[PDB]
Structure 1
Amino acid sequence: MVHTKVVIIGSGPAAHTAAIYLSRAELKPVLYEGMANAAGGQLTTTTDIENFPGFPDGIGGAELMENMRKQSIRFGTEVITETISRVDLSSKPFKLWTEWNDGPDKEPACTADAVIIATGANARRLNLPGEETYWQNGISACAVCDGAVPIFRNKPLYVIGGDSAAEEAMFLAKYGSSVTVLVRRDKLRASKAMAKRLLAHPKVTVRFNTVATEVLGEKKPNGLMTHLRIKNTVTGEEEIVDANGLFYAVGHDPATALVKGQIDLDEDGYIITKPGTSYTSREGVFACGVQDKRYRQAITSAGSGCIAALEAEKFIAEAES
Structure 2
Amino acid sequence: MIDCAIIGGGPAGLSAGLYATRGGVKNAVLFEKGMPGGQITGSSEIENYPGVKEVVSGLDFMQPWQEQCFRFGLKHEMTAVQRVSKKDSHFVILAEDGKTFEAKSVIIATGGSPKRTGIKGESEYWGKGVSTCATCDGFFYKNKEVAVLGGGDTAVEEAIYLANICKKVYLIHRRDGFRCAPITLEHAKNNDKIEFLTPYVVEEIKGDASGVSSLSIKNTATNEKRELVVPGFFIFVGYDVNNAVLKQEDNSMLCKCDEYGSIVVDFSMKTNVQGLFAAGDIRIFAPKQVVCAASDGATAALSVISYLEH
The two structures have a TM-score, normalised by structure 1, of: 0.88
More helix by share: 2
Aligned length: 302
Corresponding residue of 2:250: none
* Secondary structure of 1:144 counterpart: helix
Structure 1 letter corresponding to 2:86: L
Q: Following the alignment from structure 1 to structure 2, what is the Cα–Cα distance between the partners of residues 214 and 142?
A: 20
The yes-or-no answer on 1:248 pairing with 2:248 is no
Q: CA deviation at 1:294?
A: 5.5
8 A Cα contact 1:52 1:299, kept in partner: yes
* Secondary structure of 1:314 counterpart: helix
The yes-or-no answer on 1:54 pairing with 2:42 is no
* Residue 93 (structure 1) aligned to one of 90, 93, 100: 90
Q: Following the alignment from structure 2 to structure 1, what is the Cα–Cα distance between the partners of residues 37 and 229?
A: 34
Let me know the Cα RMSD of the aligned residues: 1.8
Corresponding residue of 1:22: 20
Q: CA deviation at 1:286?
A: 0.6
* Secondary structure of 1:239 counterpart: strand
* Residue 145 (structure 1) aligned to one of 123, 130, 136: 136
How does 1:56-135 map onto structure 2 within 5 Å?
56-99=53-96, 101-102=97-98, 107-108=99-100, 110-135=101-126
How does 1:265-276 map onto structure 2 within 5 Å?
265-274=257-266, 276=267
Q: Following the alignment from structure 2 to structure 1, what is the Cα–Cα distance between the partners of residues 39 and 289?
A: 11
Corresponding residue of 2:7: 9
| Residues 127-172 of structure 1: per-residue CA shift (max 9 Å, x gap) | 22211111111111110111112xx233321111111112222221
8 A Cα contact 1:288 1:304, kept in partner: yes
How does 1:159-308 map onto structure 2 within 5 Å?
159-160=148-149, 161-218=151-208, 220=209, 223-260=210-247, 261-274=253-266, 276-289=267-280, 290-293=282-285, 295-308=287-300
Gaps of 5+ in 2: 248-252
Corresponding residue of 1:34: 33
Provide runs of 4+ in structure 1 moved above 6 Å: none
Gaps of 5+ in 1: none
Q: Following the alignment from structure 2 to structure 1, what is the Cα–Cα distance between the partners of residues 188 and 268?
A: 33
Which shows bigger deviation, 231-240 or 138-147? 231-240
Structure 1 pair 247–33 and aligned structure 2 pair: CA distance change class (3 A): same
More strand by share: 2
Q: Following the alignment from structure 2 to structure 1, what is the Cα–Cα distance between the partners of residues 87 and 217?
A: 49
Structure 2 letter corresponding to 1:33: E
8 A Cα contact 1:253 1:269, kept in partner: no
Structure 2 letter corresponding to 1:140: S
Structure 1 pair 82–317 and aligned structure 2 pair: CA distance change class (3 A): same
Structure 2 letter corresponding to 1:159: V
Sequence identity, in percent? Answer: 33
8 A Cα contact 1:186 1:209, kept in partner: yes
Q: Following the alignment from structure 1 to structure 2, what is the Cα–Cα distance between the partners of residues 55 and 4?
A: 33
8 A Cα contact 1:256 1:270, kept in partner: yes
Corresponding residue of 1:309: 301
Q: CA deviation at 1:39?
A: 5.7
* Secondary structure of 1:303 counterpart: helix
Q: CA deviation at 1:123?
A: 1.4
Structure 1 pair 18–271 and aligned structure 2 pair: CA distance change class (3 A): same
Q: Following the alignment from structure 1 to structure 2, what is the Cα–Cα distance between the partners of residues 130 and 293?
A: 32
Q: Following the alignment from structure 2 to structure 1, what is the Cα–Cα distance between the partners of residues 54 and 193?
A: 29
Q: Following the alignment from structure 1 to structure 2, what is the Cα–Cα distance between the partners of residues 75 and 232?
A: 57
Structure 1 pair 90–231 and aligned structure 2 pair: CA distance change class (3 A): farther
8 A Cα contact 2:203 2:218, kept in partner: yes
